[PDB]
């Protein structure tokens, strides 16, 4: 059986271990390290997809689009802090008008 | 080779009856690659300051606590600790 079945994850472990030795980070990767990093990546992926699915259900759609990803990321307090210097293609901006311009 | 089928496997667990476009799949691929590069680079920086030759779950945990915000890093450390506990037991 695979190590992703042992750990109970969904992201692979051997590909992460291969990218850790291969990408010149240390004369040595440890061990529990690809399992730990795969769990962190799976949690972050599930959080992004959960907020994107909520933003997709809020507009009567069944397919997640980059506008839904843009609204999901920018309508959250901490994901906007993590992804503040990132430009998403075909994403647009948040609708807001300053209160000194409305009649 | 990419993470697309794994993004489908994660997406079918939190929202069953939904889909995703290829552009959003590419954005998720870029997100996974960017977070991988950030965590691996910070864990590579932490292992040089102490003159060690490796990288370990403690190194990955220290790179997670420095990079992620307050409420997100606690759940990330908890999920990673549960996953590394289930690997040996």
């Amino acid at each position: 059986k695979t190590r992703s079945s042992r750990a109970g994850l969904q992201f692979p472990v051997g590909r992460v271990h291969r990218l850790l030795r291969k990408g010149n980070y240390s004369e040595r990767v440890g061990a529990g390290a690809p399992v730990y990093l795969a769990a962190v990546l799976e949690y972050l992926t599930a959080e992004i997809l959960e907020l994107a699915g909520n933003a997709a259900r809020d507009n009567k759609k069944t397919r997640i689009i980059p506008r839904h990803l843009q609204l999901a990321i920018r309508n959250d307090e901490e994901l906007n802090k993590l992804l503040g210097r990132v430009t998403i293609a075909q994403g647009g901006v948040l609708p807001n008008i300053q209160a000194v311009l409305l009649p | 080779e990419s993470y697309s089928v794994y993004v489908y496997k994660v997406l079918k667990q939190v929202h069953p009856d939904t889909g995703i476009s290829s552009k959003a799949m590419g954005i998720m691929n870029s997100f996974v690659n960017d977070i991988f590069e950030r965590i691996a680079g910070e864990a590579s920086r932490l292992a040089h300051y102490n003159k060690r030759s490796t990288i370990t779950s403690r190194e990955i945990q220290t790179a997670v606590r420095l990079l992620l915000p307050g409420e997100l890093a606690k759940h990330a450390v908890s999920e990673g600790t549960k996953a590394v506990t289930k690997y040996t037991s």
Binding site: R63, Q90 | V5, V7, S21, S22, K23, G26
Partner: peptide
């Protein structure tokens, strides 16, 4: 009872695992 233009979605197709 009312729906938006499908062209909106056509410009960005779903990811194909194959």
């Amino acid at each position: 009872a009312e729906e938006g233009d499908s062209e909106s979605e056509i410009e960005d197709e779903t990811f194909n695992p194959s």
